[PDB]
Every structure is written in structure tokens, then in C-alpha cells.
Coordinates of C-alpha atoms and ligand atoms in Angstrom, one line a residue:
Chain A
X24 CA 131.1 44.4 78.2
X25 CA 129.0 45.3 81.1
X26 CA 128.0 42.3 83.6
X27 CA 124.3 40.5 84.1
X28 CA 123.9 43.1 87.3
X29 CA 125.2 46.2 86.2
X30 CA 122.7 46.1 83.2
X31 CA 120.4 45.4 85.2
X32 CA 121.7 48.0 87.5
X33 CA 120.8 50.7 84.8
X34 CA 117.8 48.8 83.2
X35 CA 116.3 49.7 87.1
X36 CA 117.1 53.4 87.4
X37 CA 116.3 54.6 83.5
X38 CA 112.4 52.8 84.5
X39 CA 112.7 54.7 87.4
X40 CA 113.3 58.1 85.6
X41 CA 110.5 57.0 82.9
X42 CA 108.1 56.3 85.4
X43 CA 109.0 59.8 87.9
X44 CA 110.1 62.6 85.4
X45 CA 107.6 64.1 84.2
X46 CA 110.1 65.5 80.4
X47 CA 107.2 67.9 79.2
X48 CA 106.4 69.2 82.6
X49 CA 102.6 68.8 81.5
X50 CA 101.8 68.1 84.8
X51 CA 102.7 70.8 86.3
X52 CA 99.6 72.6 87.0
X53 CA 98.2 75.2 89.6
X54 CA 101.5 77.2 89.9
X55 CA 101.6 80.9 91.2
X56 CA 102.6 83.4 89.3
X57 CA 104.3 87.2 89.2
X58 CA 101.6 89.6 89.9
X59 CA 99.4 91.5 87.4
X74 CA 118.0 98.4 112.2
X75 CA 121.4 97.9 111.1
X76 CA 121.2 94.5 111.2
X77 CA 118.0 93.7 109.3
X78 CA 119.5 96.5 105.9
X79 CA 122.4 93.8 106.5
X80 CA 120.6 90.3 105.5
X81 CA 118.6 92.7 103.3
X82 CA 121.5 93.7 101.6
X83 CA 123.3 89.8 101.2
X84 CA 119.8 89.1 99.9
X85 CA 119.2 91.3 97.7
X86 CA 122.9 89.7 95.9
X87 CA 121.5 86.7 96.2
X88 CA 118.1 87.5 94.4
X89 CA 120.0 89.1 91.7
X90 CA 122.4 85.8 89.8
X91 CA 119.0 84.1 90.5
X92 CA 117.4 86.0 87.0
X93 CA 115.3 84.5 84.4
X94 CA 112.5 85.8 82.2
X95 CA 109.4 83.2 82.5
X96 CA 107.8 82.5 79.2
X97 CA 104.5 80.7 79.2
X98 CA 103.1 79.1 75.4
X99 CA 99.3 78.3 74.9
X100 CA 97.9 75.5 72.9
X101 CA 96.3 77.8 71.5
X102 CA 99.9 79.7 70.0
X103 CA 99.1 82.3 72.8
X104 CA 102.5 83.2 74.5
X105 CA 102.4 85.0 77.7
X106 CA 105.6 86.5 79.0
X107 CA 106.8 87.5 81.8
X108 CA 110.3 90.4 82.8
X109 CA 111.2 90.7 86.6
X110 CA 112.0 93.5 87.9
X111 CA 115.3 95.6 88.1
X112 CA 116.3 96.0 91.7
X113 CA 114.1 98.9 93.3
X114 CA 113.3 99.8 97.2
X115 CA 113.0 96.2 98.1
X116 CA 110.2 93.2 97.9
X117 CA 109.6 93.1 94.2
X118 CA 112.4 91.1 93.6
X119 CA 110.9 88.5 95.4
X120 CA 108.3 88.1 92.4
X121 CA 109.4 85.1 91.0
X122 CA 109.9 83.3 94.4
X123 CA 106.3 81.8 94.8
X124 CA 106.6 80.6 90.9
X125 CA 110.0 79.0 92.1
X126 CA 108.7 77.4 95.5
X127 CA 106.0 75.8 93.3
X128 CA 108.3 74.5 90.3
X129 CA 111.5 73.1 92.8
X130 CA 108.5 71.8 94.9
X131 CA 106.8 69.2 91.6
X132 CA 110.8 68.5 90.7
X133 CA 110.8 67.2 95.0
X134 CA 107.8 64.9 94.3
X135 CA 109.4 64.0 91.2
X136 CA 112.9 63.1 92.7
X137 CA 111.0 61.6 95.8
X138 CA 109.3 59.3 93.9
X139 CA 112.1 58.4 92.1
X140 CA 113.7 57.3 94.8
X141 CA 111.3 55.4 96.2
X142 CA 110.9 52.7 92.8
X143 CA 114.3 51.7 93.7
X144 CA 115.5 48.8 95.3
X145 CA 118.3 49.4 96.7
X146 CA 117.3 52.7 98.3
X147 CA 113.6 51.5 99.3
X148 CA 115.9 48.3 101.1
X149 CA 117.4 51.0 103.3
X150 CA 115.8 52.5 106.6
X151 CA 113.0 54.5 106.4
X152 CA 115.6 57.4 108.4
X153 CA 118.3 57.3 106.0
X154 CA 115.8 57.5 102.8
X155 CA 115.1 61.0 104.2
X156 CA 118.2 62.3 105.3
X157 CA 119.5 60.9 101.9
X158 CA 116.3 62.9 100.1
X159 CA 117.2 65.6 102.0
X160 CA 121.2 66.0 101.5
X161 CA 120.2 65.0 97.0
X162 CA 117.2 66.7 96.6
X163 CA 118.6 69.6 94.9
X164 CA 121.4 68.1 93.3
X165 CA 118.9 66.1 91.7
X166 CA 116.8 68.6 90.6
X167 CA 119.4 70.2 88.4
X168 CA 120.9 67.6 87.0
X169 CA 117.0 66.6 85.6
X170 CA 117.4 70.3 84.5
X171 CA 120.6 70.1 82.7
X172 CA 118.3 67.3 80.5
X173 CA 116.3 69.9 79.4
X174 CA 119.0 72.4 79.1
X175 CA 120.2 74.7 76.0
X176 CA 123.0 75.6 75.9
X177 CA 122.8 78.2 72.9
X178 CA 120.0 80.0 74.1
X179 CA 120.6 80.1 77.9
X180 CA 117.3 78.8 78.2
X181 CA 116.1 75.9 80.5
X182 CA 112.9 74.1 78.2
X183 CA 109.9 72.7 80.4
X184 CA 107.5 71.9 78.2
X185 CA 105.1 74.4 77.3
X186 CA 106.9 76.6 80.5
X187 CA 110.7 78.7 79.2
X188 CA 113.3 80.0 81.7
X189 CA 115.7 82.5 80.3
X190 CA 118.7 84.1 81.8
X201 CA 128.6 82.1 83.3
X202 CA 130.8 83.0 86.7
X203 CA 127.6 82.1 89.3
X204 CA 128.1 78.5 89.4
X205 CA 125.0 77.4 89.1
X206 CA 124.9 78.6 85.5
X207 CA 128.2 77.7 84.3
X208 CA 127.4 74.1 85.9
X209 CA 124.8 73.9 83.6
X210 CA 127.2 74.8 80.3
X211 CA 129.5 72.7 81.5
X212 CA 127.5 69.3 82.5
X213 CA 125.6 70.3 78.9
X214 CA 128.8 70.0 77.2
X215 CA 129.5 67.1 78.2
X216 CA 126.6 65.3 76.2
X217 CA 126.2 62.7 78.2
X218 CA 123.3 59.9 77.6
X219 CA 120.6 59.2 79.4
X220 CA 122.2 56.4 81.5
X221 CA 125.0 58.4 82.4
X222 CA 122.4 61.2 83.9
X223 CA 120.5 58.5 85.8
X224 CA 123.4 57.2 87.2
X225 CA 125.1 60.4 88.2
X226 CA 121.4 60.5 89.9
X227 CA 122.1 57.6 91.7
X228 CA 125.6 58.5 93.0
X229 CA 124.8 61.6 94.3
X230 CA 121.8 60.3 95.4
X231 CA 123.7 57.9 97.5
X232 CA 125.9 60.0 99.3
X233 CA 126.7 58.3 102.7
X234 CA 128.3 61.3 104.1
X235 CA 124.8 63.0 104.3
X236 CA 124.3 64.7 107.5
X237 CA 122.3 62.3 109.8
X238 CA 123.2 58.8 107.8
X239 CA 123.7 55.3 109.7
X240 CA 124.2 53.4 107.6
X241 CA 126.8 55.1 106.7
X242 CA 128.8 51.7 105.2
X243 CA 125.8 50.2 103.0
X244 CA 125.4 53.6 101.5
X245 CA 129.4 53.7 100.4
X246 CA 129.0 50.2 98.7
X247 CA 126.0 51.6 96.9
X248 CA 127.5 54.0 95.8
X249 CA 131.2 52.5 94.7
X250 CA 128.1 49.9 93.1
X251 CA 127.0 52.8 91.0
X252 CA 130.1 54.7 90.0
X253 CA 132.2 51.1 89.4
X254 CA 129.1 50.6 86.6
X255 CA 129.2 54.6 85.4
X256 CA 133.4 53.8 84.4
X257 CA 132.5 50.5 82.6
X258 CA 129.8 51.9 80.7
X259 CA 131.4 54.4 79.3
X260 CA 134.3 52.4 78.9
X261 CA 132.1 49.7 77.1
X262 CA 129.9 52.7 74.9
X263 CA 132.5 55.0 73.8
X264 CA 135.3 55.5 71.3
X265 CA 138.5 54.9 73.5
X266 CA 141.0 57.1 74.0
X267 CA 138.5 60.3 73.3
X268 CA 136.4 59.1 76.1
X269 CA 139.4 59.0 78.8
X270 CA 139.0 60.8 81.0
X271 CA 134.9 61.7 80.8
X272 CA 133.7 59.9 84.2
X273 CA 136.7 61.9 86.0
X274 CA 135.2 64.5 84.6
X275 CA 131.4 63.6 85.3
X276 CA 132.5 62.7 89.1
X277 CA 134.2 66.2 89.4
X278 CA 130.8 68.0 87.8
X279 CA 129.2 66.6 91.1
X280 CA 131.9 67.4 93.6
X281 CA 131.1 70.9 92.6
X282 CA 127.2 70.4 92.2
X283 CA 127.5 69.9 96.0
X284 CA 129.3 72.9 95.9
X285 CA 126.8 74.4 94.5
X286 CA 123.9 72.5 96.7
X287 CA 125.5 73.9 99.9
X288 CA 125.5 77.5 98.4
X289 CA 122.5 77.7 97.7
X290 CA 120.6 76.2 100.9
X291 CA 122.4 79.3 102.3
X292 CA 121.0 81.8 100.4
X293 CA 117.3 80.1 100.4
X294 CA 117.4 80.1 104.2
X295 CA 118.4 83.7 104.9
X296 CA 115.9 84.8 101.6
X297 CA 113.3 82.7 103.8
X298 CA 114.2 84.0 107.4
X299 CA 113.5 87.9 105.8
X300 CA 110.9 87.0 103.0
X301 CA 109.0 83.6 103.6
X302 CA 108.5 81.6 99.7
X303 CA 108.7 78.3 101.0
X304 CA 106.3 75.7 100.6
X305 CA 105.3 73.4 103.6
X306 CA 107.9 70.3 101.7
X307 CA 110.2 72.9 101.5
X308 CA 110.8 73.9 104.7
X309 CA 111.1 69.7 105.7
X310 CA 113.9 69.7 103.4
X311 CA 115.4 72.3 103.9
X312 CA 115.3 72.7 107.5
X313 CA 113.2 75.7 107.9
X325 CA 111.9 65.0 117.8
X326 CA 113.2 62.8 115.8
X327 CA 113.9 62.4 111.9
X328 CA 110.1 61.0 110.8
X329 CA 109.0 63.1 113.0
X330 CA 110.4 66.8 111.6
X331 CA 109.5 65.2 108.3
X332 CA 106.0 64.5 108.5
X333 CA 105.2 64.8 104.5
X334 CA 108.0 63.5 102.8
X335 CA 107.8 60.3 105.0
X336 CA 104.3 60.1 103.6
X337 CA 105.0 60.3 100.5
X338 CA 107.7 57.6 101.4
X339 CA 105.1 55.6 102.4
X340 CA 103.1 55.4 100.1
Chain B
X24 CA 90.3 136.2 69.5
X25 CA 87.8 134.0 71.0
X26 CA 84.0 135.6 72.5
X27 CA 83.6 135.4 75.9
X28 CA 81.0 132.9 75.2
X29 CA 83.5 130.6 73.1
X30 CA 86.5 130.7 75.5
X31 CA 84.1 129.6 78.6
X32 CA 82.4 127.0 76.1
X33 CA 86.2 125.9 75.6
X34 CA 86.9 126.1 79.3
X35 CA 84.3 124.3 80.4
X36 CA 84.5 121.6 78.3
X37 CA 88.7 121.6 79.1
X38 CA 87.7 121.0 82.8
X39 CA 85.2 118.3 82.1
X40 CA 88.0 116.2 80.1
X41 CA 90.4 116.3 82.6
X42 CA 87.6 115.8 85.2
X43 CA 86.3 112.2 83.3
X44 CA 89.4 110.6 81.4
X45 CA 92.0 109.5 83.6
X46 CA 94.9 109.2 81.0
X47 CA 96.9 107.3 83.2
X48 CA 94.3 104.8 83.0
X49 CA 95.2 104.1 86.5
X50 CA 91.9 103.4 87.8
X51 CA 91.5 100.8 85.3
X52 CA 91.5 97.4 87.3
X53 CA 90.2 93.6 87.7
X54 CA 89.8 93.3 84.1
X55 CA 89.9 89.9 82.6
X56 CA 92.8 88.7 80.7
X57 CA 93.6 85.8 78.3
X58 CA 94.1 82.9 80.0
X59 CA 97.7 81.8 80.9
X60 CA 96.9 77.8 79.4
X81 CA 82.3 82.7 60.9
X82 CA 84.2 83.7 57.8
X83 CA 83.4 87.1 57.7
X84 CA 83.7 87.3 61.9
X85 CA 87.6 86.0 61.2
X86 CA 88.3 88.6 58.4
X87 CA 87.2 92.0 61.6
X88 CA 89.1 90.3 64.2
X89 CA 92.5 90.2 62.1
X90 CA 92.5 93.5 61.2
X91 CA 92.7 94.7 64.7
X92 CA 95.3 92.6 66.1
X93 CA 97.5 94.1 68.5
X94 CA 99.5 92.6 71.4
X95 CA 98.7 93.1 75.1
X96 CA 102.2 94.9 77.4
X97 CA 101.3 95.1 81.5
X98 CA 104.3 97.2 83.2
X99 CA 104.5 96.2 86.7
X100 CA 104.7 99.7 89.4
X101 CA 108.2 97.5 90.5
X102 CA 109.7 97.5 86.7
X103 CA 108.4 94.5 85.9
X104 CA 107.1 93.9 82.0
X105 CA 104.0 91.3 81.1
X106 CA 103.6 90.7 77.5
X107 CA 100.7 88.5 75.5
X108 CA 100.8 88.0 71.7
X109 CA 97.8 86.4 70.8
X110 CA 97.2 83.5 68.9
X111 CA 97.9 83.3 64.8
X112 CA 94.5 82.3 63.3
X113 CA 94.9 78.5 63.5
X114 CA 90.8 77.7 62.7
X115 CA 88.7 79.0 65.5
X116 CA 87.6 79.9 68.9
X117 CA 91.2 81.1 69.7
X118 CA 90.8 84.3 67.8
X119 CA 88.5 85.3 70.5
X120 CA 91.2 85.3 73.7
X121 CA 91.2 89.3 74.5
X122 CA 87.6 90.2 73.7
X123 CA 87.2 89.8 77.6
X124 CA 90.1 91.9 78.1
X125 CA 88.6 94.3 75.2
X126 CA 85.4 94.7 76.3
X127 CA 86.4 95.9 80.1
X128 CA 88.8 98.6 78.6
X129 CA 85.7 99.5 76.2
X130 CA 83.5 99.2 79.4
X131 CA 85.9 101.2 80.9
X132 CA 85.8 103.8 78.6
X133 CA 82.6 104.3 78.0
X134 CA 81.8 104.9 81.3
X135 CA 84.8 107.8 81.7
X136 CA 82.7 109.1 78.7
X137 CA 79.7 108.8 80.1
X138 CA 81.3 110.9 83.3
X139 CA 82.2 113.2 80.5
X140 CA 78.7 114.4 79.4
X141 CA 76.6 114.5 83.2
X142 CA 79.2 117.9 84.1
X143 CA 78.8 119.3 81.0
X144 CA 75.6 121.9 81.4
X145 CA 74.2 121.5 77.7
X146 CA 74.1 118.2 78.0
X147 CA 72.7 117.6 82.0
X148 CA 69.3 120.1 80.8
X149 CA 68.5 118.1 77.9
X150 CA 65.5 115.2 78.7
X151 CA 67.0 111.9 80.3
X152 CA 66.1 110.0 77.5
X153 CA 67.9 112.4 74.6
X154 CA 70.8 112.4 77.0
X155 CA 70.4 108.1 76.3
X156 CA 69.7 108.7 73.0
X157 CA 73.1 110.8 72.6
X158 CA 74.9 109.2 74.7
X159 CA 74.5 105.6 72.6
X160 CA 75.0 107.2 69.2
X161 CA 78.2 108.6 70.0
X162 CA 79.4 106.8 72.6
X163 CA 82.1 104.4 70.3
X164 CA 82.7 108.1 68.6
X165 CA 84.5 110.1 72.0
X166 CA 86.3 106.5 73.1
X167 CA 88.5 106.4 69.4
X168 CA 88.7 110.2 70.3
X169 CA 90.3 109.8 73.8
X170 CA 91.9 106.8 72.8
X171 CA 93.8 108.2 69.4
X172 CA 95.4 111.1 72.1
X173 CA 97.0 108.0 73.5
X174 CA 97.8 106.6 70.3
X175 CA 101.7 106.2 69.5
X176 CA 101.8 107.0 65.5
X177 CA 105.9 105.6 65.2
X178 CA 105.4 102.4 68.0
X179 CA 101.8 101.8 66.1
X180 CA 100.6 101.4 69.9
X181 CA 97.8 103.0 72.3
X182 CA 99.3 103.6 75.2
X183 CA 97.4 103.8 78.2
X184 CA 99.7 104.1 81.9
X185 CA 100.9 100.6 82.3
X186 CA 98.9 98.9 79.4
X187 CA 100.1 98.8 75.9
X188 CA 97.7 97.9 72.8
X189 CA 100.6 97.5 70.0
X190 CA 99.0 96.8 66.9
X191 CA 100.8 92.7 65.1
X199 CA 98.6 97.7 54.4
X200 CA 97.4 97.9 57.4
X201 CA 95.6 101.4 56.3
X202 CA 93.5 99.4 54.8
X203 CA 91.2 98.6 57.9
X204 CA 89.2 101.9 58.0
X205 CA 89.7 102.2 62.1
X206 CA 93.6 102.0 61.5
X207 CA 93.7 104.9 59.0
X208 CA 91.5 107.1 61.2
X209 CA 94.0 107.5 64.4
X210 CA 96.5 107.3 61.8
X211 CA 95.3 110.9 59.3
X212 CA 93.2 112.5 62.7
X213 CA 97.3 111.8 64.7
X214 CA 98.9 113.4 61.4
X215 CA 96.9 116.5 62.3
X216 CA 98.6 117.9 65.5
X217 CA 95.3 118.3 67.0
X218 CA 95.6 120.1 70.6
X219 CA 93.6 119.7 73.3
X220 CA 91.2 122.2 72.8
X221 CA 90.5 120.8 69.3
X222 CA 90.1 116.9 70.3
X223 CA 87.6 118.1 73.1
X224 CA 85.2 120.5 70.8
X225 CA 85.1 116.9 68.0
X226 CA 84.0 115.1 71.1
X227 CA 81.6 117.6 71.3
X228 CA 80.6 118.3 68.1
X229 CA 79.7 114.1 67.8
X230 CA 78.7 113.8 71.3
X231 CA 75.5 116.5 70.2
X232 CA 74.4 115.2 67.2
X233 CA 70.6 115.8 66.5
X234 CA 70.5 113.2 63.8
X235 CA 71.4 110.1 66.3
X236 CA 68.3 107.6 66.5
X237 CA 65.5 108.6 69.3
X238 CA 66.6 112.2 69.6
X239 CA 63.4 114.3 70.3
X240 CA 64.9 117.4 70.6
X241 CA 66.8 117.4 67.2
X242 CA 66.3 121.4 67.2
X243 CA 67.9 122.0 70.7
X244 CA 71.1 119.6 69.7
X245 CA 71.2 120.8 66.7
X246 CA 71.6 124.4 67.1
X247 CA 74.3 123.2 70.1
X248 CA 76.6 121.4 67.8
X249 CA 76.4 124.4 65.9
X250 CA 78.5 126.3 68.3
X251 CA 80.6 124.1 68.7
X252 CA 81.5 123.4 65.6
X253 CA 81.4 128.1 65.6
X254 CA 83.6 127.7 67.9
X255 CA 85.9 125.2 66.7
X256 CA 86.3 126.9 63.8
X257 CA 87.2 130.5 65.9
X258 CA 89.2 128.6 68.3
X259 CA 91.7 127.3 65.0
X260 CA 91.4 130.4 62.8
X261 CA 92.6 132.4 66.2
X262 CA 96.0 130.1 67.3
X263 CA 97.4 127.9 63.7
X264 CA 98.0 130.9 61.5
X265 CA 101.2 127.9 59.2
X266 CA 100.0 127.4 55.9
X267 CA 100.2 123.3 57.3
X268 CA 97.2 123.3 59.3
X269 CA 95.0 125.4 56.0
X270 CA 91.6 123.9 55.8
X271 CA 92.0 122.2 58.8
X272 CA 88.6 122.8 60.2
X273 CA 87.3 121.5 56.8
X274 CA 89.7 117.9 57.8
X275 CA 88.1 117.7 61.0
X276 CA 84.8 118.3 60.4
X277 CA 85.5 116.0 57.3
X278 CA 87.2 113.6 59.9
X279 CA 83.9 113.3 62.3
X280 CA 82.3 112.2 59.4
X281 CA 84.4 109.6 58.3
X282 CA 84.2 108.6 62.5
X283 CA 80.6 108.1 62.0
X284 CA 81.0 105.5 59.1
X285 CA 83.5 103.5 61.3
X286 CA 81.0 104.2 64.2
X287 CA 78.2 101.5 62.1
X288 CA 80.8 99.8 60.9
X289 CA 82.2 98.5 64.0
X290 CA 78.6 97.7 66.0
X291 CA 78.2 94.9 62.5
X292 CA 81.0 93.9 62.9
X293 CA 80.5 93.5 67.2
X294 CA 76.7 92.0 66.5
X295 CA 78.3 89.4 64.0
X296 CA 81.4 88.2 67.0
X297 CA 78.7 88.4 69.6
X298 CA 76.1 86.4 67.9
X299 CA 78.9 83.8 67.0
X300 CA 80.6 84.2 69.9
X301 CA 78.5 86.6 73.3
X302 CA 81.2 88.8 75.3
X303 CA 80.0 91.9 75.7
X304 CA 79.6 94.0 78.7
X305 CA 76.1 94.1 80.1
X306 CA 77.1 98.0 79.6
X307 CA 78.0 97.5 75.9
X308 CA 74.7 95.4 75.1
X309 CA 72.9 98.5 76.1
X310 CA 74.8 101.0 74.2
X311 CA 74.5 99.2 71.0
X312 CA 71.2 98.0 71.1
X313 CA 68.9 97.4 70.1
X326 CA 60.3 103.1 77.0
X327 CA 64.0 104.5 76.5
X328 CA 64.9 104.5 80.2
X329 CA 63.6 100.6 80.7
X330 CA 65.7 98.9 78.3
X331 CA 68.6 101.2 79.5
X332 CA 68.8 100.3 82.7
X333 CA 72.7 100.7 84.2
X334 CA 72.3 104.1 81.7
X335 CA 69.9 105.5 83.5
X336 CA 71.8 104.9 86.6
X337 CA 75.0 106.2 86.0
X338 CA 72.9 109.8 84.3
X339 CA 71.1 110.0 87.7
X340 CA 74.5 109.0 89.8
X341 CA 76.3 112.6 90.6
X342 CA 79.8 113.4 88.6
Ligands
HCJ1 O1 113.0 76.0 89.2 C1 113.9 75.9 88.8 C2 113.7 76.9 88.0 C3 114.3 77.0 86.6 N1 115.8 76.3 86.9 C4 116.4 75.7 87.7 N2 114.7 75.3 88.7 O2 117.9 75.5 88.3 C5 118.3 76.2 86.8 C6 118.3 77.6 87.7 O3 117.3 78.7 87.6 C7 116.8 78.2 88.7 C8 116.4 79.1 89.6 C9 115.3 78.9 90.6 C10 115.7 77.9 91.4 C11 115.3 77.2 93.1 C12 114.3 78.9 93.4 C13 113.6 78.1 94.6 C14 113.8 77.1 94.8 C15 114.6 76.3 94.9 C16 115.2 74.8 95.5 F1 114.7 74.2 94.9 F2 116.2 75.0 95.9 F3 114.3 74.7 96.3 C17 115.3 76.5 93.3 C18 116.8 77.7 90.7 C19 117.5 77.1 89.9 C20 117.0 76.1 86.3

């Protein structure tokens, strides 16, 4: 079995998750919707690729039974494929806030210095959002099912990530431990208490390993923990790749919300991050 | 061939049609849409259930599927939109009548009376020209209205039958003219001048058909069209009734619609009067 310490480590993460993860997206409201030189062109062509991968239809089920459905353009002359970016900005921003709240209720994270709390959330925010998104991914229909909202589409790393993680059929406890391990990465830019963070991450990984030994049948889940650790490594790479895409798009066509600007780097740490700081302070 | 006077007549109507019928609906704007989120009344709404498509000038597509009837109130979701579209069509019809010499010479009160009586009908006639019978959808530029046995609903049957006749533009516009100059609309004073005008349009229609449609597919075409116009008059009455029932339970009509659908003429129709006095 798990040590008492480990079971309560899990209890605390699971309670943090249930307090701060709106799984039906009921409180996602007031979001925007798609409306109803040589160097510059070199920037644009890189951005066109970046936005292609980024293609979903959007579905909108009302209470009455009505359904609105949005289908994105094909890429033409220019702007029309920035159509979804305001909506996406709002969805991510909503998801980030939940992730910030998640971090805050965790004693282990609270005790860290505010500046490290900021650095860790800057470093992991995208990864935890994707981990949460995976839990509402339906691999049969290639659809993220977010309450009344749906996003519908394997070489794109992000998409293959979600099919792959979904195949592992993780438990809630394993997802939330994944979130902890990603959140407490000692090797994020700007982290100071490297030693403390590392020991905390190791605690979580050990806890995750132990959970798997104890709760899943023997030889068949022999390597599950290492597979999960491999997924985290792949997610970390997707994070970096995705940040660079977002920064290129932002550069030519600004879309990021204030909070997103703080996270992606768009004086001091707390001063470059007044919103994040506020959100952590309350 | 046609007399000179008839050629001229058709030319004026066709010119009028072209000037006042935006077939790409490019200037239909600022309409309401369903939010993103009694027994007789429910029967009405259900017969004429459509899904709505809007294509962006960029390639994008929004599609809206209506709720199944599960109780009430959700069955009214498309009404504000339908009212905006009908109001846009009616204004085009008003412009159409305005540019016709034979109409603008009538007393302002008859102009009002004829338009009250015919607007719905002319609107359906224009809608039929953008009706796709294969797909069951009215194709209005970037907007589309797709039907969700159905011929049982007189409105739907009308559009299918009329589409089947494969009329020319000339024939649609002569139908519009005949419907417009109905001497027996309520409140019409110069019923005699109107009747003579209607008779000349009907004669021109019959002559046009004889000078242009030899094929046995078109035998009796003129008489079918006139029969269709009588049927359209009956649908008009029916649909006006449906609308009052629905407006009673649940208001949705625009101010211009409330004017057209009733019930000193100029005083009770301030918007019409205004549009008629305005230059075309
Ligand atoms: O916002 C969403 C909506 C759906 N999904 C998701 N994020 O992760 C999966 C793949 O689809 C995506 C579409 C857009 C983004 C996106 C767009 C703009 C900004 C951001 C970010 F969070 F990084 F700021 C993320 C991410 C993923 C599934």
C-alpha cells in the first residue's frame, strides 16, 4: 500500500483538482466568437504553417437543443485564419486561471517563495492545461468535449500527444500526479529554490510510482510509470514548440490576453507579472 | 411578337426588378440571430422548420440547427431573424412598386392598400427565384435556409410546384405585377383603374408565353400561372393568420410588419407612407 504521507499527498491534489477544475466548463462565459516586406512575408509564411496545424471546428450546444457550428476558412490571402484566435485566447485564459487556482490550494506550492510560484506557473501553465484538456478528449471522435462547447479536428505533436496519453487510460489520481510533477519542475527559467523543488517533484514521482504498483495489476502495467514520464517529456517539448508559434503570431497579429502576455513574456519578476501576482495573492 | 406597348411594359418591369432586387442579399445586415446559449401555434412553426447557414466572405461557415420542439419558447428562436429578413424583402418590394409608372401615379392611399395586400405575395415570388428544389434550400447570397409529407404544407408545395414550371424572369415579374395590381384588396378605391391595369399585365403575360414557349412541356402554362397566383393569394391569408396567432402569444414582428399585417390609411401606416414619399 501507499504510505500515509503519500495517500494524503494524493488527497490534497485530488481536492485541489476538484475545487478548481470546472469539468463541464459551466463558468466559461463571455468569450469572443469568430465574427459572423521580404522579411515580413517570411514572418507571415511561418505563421501560416503555425495556424494550419491549429485547426478545429467549433460546436455550440444551447440549453433549448439548438446547435451552432463554426467551420474555419481555408487559408486565403491573409487575416481570415486569425478568426479563431480571440476565442482561443479566452479559452486558454480561462484554463490558466483554473491552473493558477489549482497551484494555490496546494500547501507544498503555497509555501514556496512567491517569485518561484510565478516562475513555476509560467513554466508549466500550458502543460497543465493540456493535461486537463486530455481528460475531456474523446479519442474516437477526435473531439475535446468541454461542456456545451466542442472542439473537433496525427503528425502534429500536440494531437498525437492527446491520442497517446488517452490510450493509457489514466485514473484521476494519475492525471493529478502528472500535473504535480509538471508543475514542480526545478529546471524552469527563473527558479531559485532548485533544490527544494526537485525534492518535491521526486516526492510526487515516487508517489506516482507507488500508486501504480499498488493499484494496477502486476506485470501488465510494469512500465506505466515510465510511459507517463515519457509523455511529460514530450509535453515539455510541445510546450516550447507551441510558445514559439504563439510568439510569432502575436508579433504580427496581437491576440493574447493580458494574463497570457504575462505568462509567455509578451524591473523584477513580480513587477513584470502584476496580474499573476495578484491572482496568487488572493 | 409582342406589341410595342407590351415590349415596353416588360422592359419597365424587368428594369424595376433589377434595380430593387438584390439577389446576392449583400446589403442585408444587422439582423438578429438565435442566441448562442398554443397548440395551434406549435403546428404552424413546425411545418416550416429550417436550419440557417452563413458563409463568411473568407470561406468560413456558421451553421445553426434549430431545437427540437420540447415544450415551448425554444420554437421561437428563429423568429426575430425571419422578421428581419422579411422586413428587408418587403422594403425591396416597396422599392419595386415605387419605380413602376403605373403604380406611382396611383393615389397614395391605394399605393398603401395594394402593398398591404401584396407584399407577402411578392416576397414569396422573389424567394422562389432563389429556391433550390434539389436541396430544398433558399439560397440568399451568403445566407441559406434549408428545410429540416412536406408538400402537405401549402407554402412548401407552392414553392416546389412553381419551381417546377421553370419560369423566365419576365414571367416572375409579370406575376409580381399581377399580384401587386389586385383591384380587390381591402381599402382600394380606384378598383377600376387597378382592374384595367391588372388585365393588361395578364394579357402581356399570355402574349409573352405564346411568343416564347412552343414546347408541349409548356402547354397551358399561362393558366397554370394564374392558378398559382390564386393559390398564392390563399396562402397569403393563411400565413397572415398564422402570424397573428404567433404574435399574440409571442411578439416578434418589426414595426414595418405590424403595419403591413394590419389591422386615414396614411395615419396608421407612418413607415409605409414615409417610404412611398421617399425617392427611389
Ligand atoms: O483552447 C484549447 C481548445 C481546445 N484544445 C486545446 N486548447 O488543446 C487541444 C488542441 O487544440 C488547441 C487549440 C488552440 C490552442 C491554443 C490557442 C491559443 C493559445 C493557447 C495557449 F494556451 F497556449 F495560450 C492555446 C491550444 C490547443 C484541445
